[PDB]
Amino acid sequence: AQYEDGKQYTTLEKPVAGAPQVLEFFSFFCPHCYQFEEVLHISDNVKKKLPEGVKMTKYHVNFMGGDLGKDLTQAWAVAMALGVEDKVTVPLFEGVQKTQTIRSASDIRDVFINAGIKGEEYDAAWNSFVVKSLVAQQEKAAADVQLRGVPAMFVNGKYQLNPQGMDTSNMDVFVQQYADTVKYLSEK
Ligand SMILES: COc1cccc(Oc2ccc3c(CC(=O)O)coc3c2)c1
């Protein structure tokens, strides 16, 4: 078969009941995740191959970056709560991995301020229980699949993308294979 379990994807031994349709995990510390966002634009190319309105979910993880990694999961919860993911993803990636100007929770806040989020608005969200709940959600989703590495994408809580089984000589061909595999899995 053109798509087969163990090749472009694997099948979770313990399916996760009631998981998002398309669930992506990343870390702002993760070098491949940097490539996935700035160079390959995986999330956008998956979205363009799914039916309009389909829910794509992207969550941050704690297991990279120690203390600052946990701060970044909370800041991503702030980003999701405020709807400003598209405003802070690039400057957070570049702050952690390119310029290395993000060394504290205050430096993370600076990124939001520079992106136009008001300080009182950021601080109110940071300390809110809605954000605490969004942190819990991100952690639970990762725990549900015993997540030990990123980037990762899961489809319907049953299938995990396997990008190691794809040619990488051409960046554009790899992206479309990835997105076509998500589409195929979403139609299973
Ligand atoms: C410029 O960046 C690119 C572009 C195209 C292909 C490519 O190849 C990859 C991408 C991600 C991963 C992972 C994910 C992990 O396990 O961290 C494992 O092997 C990988 C191989 C990298």
Author numbering: 1 to 188
Can I see the authors' text?
The highly oxidising protein DsbA catalyses disulfide bond formation between two cysteine residues of unfolded substrates in the periplasm of Gram-negative bacteria. The structure of DsbA is comprised of a thioredoxin domain with an inserted helical domain. Adjacent to the active site is a hydrophobic groove which serves as a site for both DsbB and unfolded substrates to form a complex.
As the crystal structure of the p-anisidine analogue 16 showed that the installation of the p-methoxy group induced a shift of the benzofuran core away from His32 (relative to anilino 15), the m-methoxy substituted phenyl ether 26 was synthesised to observe whether the shift could be avoided. The co-structure showed a horizontal rotation relative to the unsubstituted phenoxy 25 (comparable to 16) but notably a less pronounced shift into the left-hand side of the binding groove, meaning the π-stacking interaction between the benzofuran core and His32 could be better retained. The m-methoxy group of 26 may potentially form a polar interaction with side chain of Gln35, although electron density for this compound was insufficient to unambiguously define the interaction. This suggests that 26 may not engage any polar interactions with DsbA despite its close proximity to the polar residues His32 and Gln35. Adding functional groups (16 and 26) or extending the ring linker increased the heavy atom count but did not contribute to binding affinity; therefore, leading to less efficient binders.
